[PDB]
């Protein structure tokens, strides 16, 4: 039997499938950039989305249906995702250090000034300010959703989390429209390189946060979350606030200062 309150996982195959799917992505990028084949890359993308869906559905099955989630288990899950958040913080900090080393001392080939000549930077007080307002408003709406969960209100939570997802989708399509109507490209020097890598990785992270929010929404509408044991939604709030903090550093760093 078992007397420890730790969950013993059944032998599960999604480690092997996810690992070889990451092998498929790496080989697909190599085959796309050089030998120009797209089928292996799409096969890998399908393999990750299938493996991730089955892994997280298994976690849902063992959590909210079998009840293997003792308080030590979600304490460990809190520790693990906090560690993952810190890892992503230092990833974006490496990108910020690249931008700061780029813009602190401009070189002779750029002309010795930031911004370089022949580029038109985005004025910060238009629609990037709207993106900051949208992300902050989504943070406030998800805090309303968290307090509606703790207090025990369902329809207030549904309205709050629905408008949180709506502003997340509005933010990412507004950012995509600004990738459309911008006056400089990724081949426009170190300014374009730093700008588009930083904003693109933030865009990938906010669409990951939006997907995690929408699966949290369908889980809530399927009555999975109880009054206090609702760790997936707290995970959504934590990652969403992390994306908000990263965008605040982006808007102060790149968009406003030096432009």
């Amino acid at each position: 039997h078992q007397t420890h309150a730790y969950h013993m996982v059944n032998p599960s195959p999604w480690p092997l499938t996810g690992a070889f799917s990451a092998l498929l992505l790496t080989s697909g990028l190599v085959m796309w950039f050089h030998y120009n084949s797209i089928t292996l890359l799409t096969l890998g993308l399908l393999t990750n989305i299938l493996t991730m869906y089955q892994w997280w559905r298994d976690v849902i099955r063992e959590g909210t249906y079998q009840g293997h989630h003792t308080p030590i288990v979600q304490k460990g899950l809190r520790y693990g995702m906090i560690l993952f958040i810190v890892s992503e913080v230092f990833f974006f900090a490496g990108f910020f250090w690249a931008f700061y080393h780029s813009s602190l001392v401009p070189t002779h080939d750029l002309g010795g000034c930031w911004p370089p000549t022949g580029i038109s930077p985005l004025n910060p007080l238009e629609v990037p300010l709207l993106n900051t307002s949208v992300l902050l408003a989504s943070g406030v709406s998800i805090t309303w959703a968290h307090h509606s969960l703790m207090e025990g209100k369902r329809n207030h939570m549904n309205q709050a989390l629905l408008i949180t997802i709506m502003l997340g989708l509005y933010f990412t399509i507004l950012q995509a429209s600004e990738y459309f109507e911008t006056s400089f490209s990724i081949s426009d020097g170190i300014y374009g390189s730093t700008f588009f890598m930083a904003t693109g990785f933030h865009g990938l992270h906010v669409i990951i946060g939006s997907t995690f929010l929408i699966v949290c929404l369908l889980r809530q509408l399927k009555f999975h979350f109880t009054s206090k044991h609702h760790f997936g939604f707290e995970a959504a709030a934590w990652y969403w606030h992390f994306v908000d903090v990263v965008w605040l550093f982006l808007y102060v760093s790149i968009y406003w200062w030096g432009s």
């Binding site: 070189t107 002779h108 750029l110």
Partner: protein, 79 residues
């Protein structure tokens, strides 16, 4: 006059190992003196010394590329 220029002196403003900004700023100062003496109409060649300074510091390839992009009009330095 500071001629009989035998080699470049020790510049106290940029005293470290990296000497890129010395030749970039000295070539920029030479062209800005060319502009200033063109607008003033006076003696250009009194800052001919500046020219010899960049001739000692950054190589023939860098200087030749910079003459090419000032001849075409693709110079990011605001002269």
């Amino acid at each position: 006059k500071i001629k009989n220029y035998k080699t470049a002196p020790f510049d106290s403003r940029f005293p470290n190992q990296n000497q890129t900004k010395n030749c970039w700023q000295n070539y920029l100062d030479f062209h800005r003196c060319e502009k200033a003496m063109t607008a003033k109409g006076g003696d250009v060649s009194v800052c001919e010394w500046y020219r010899r300074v960049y001739k000692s510091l950054c190589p023939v390839s860098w200087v030749s590329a910079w003459d090419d992009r000032i001849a075409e009009g693709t110079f990011p330095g605001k002269i």
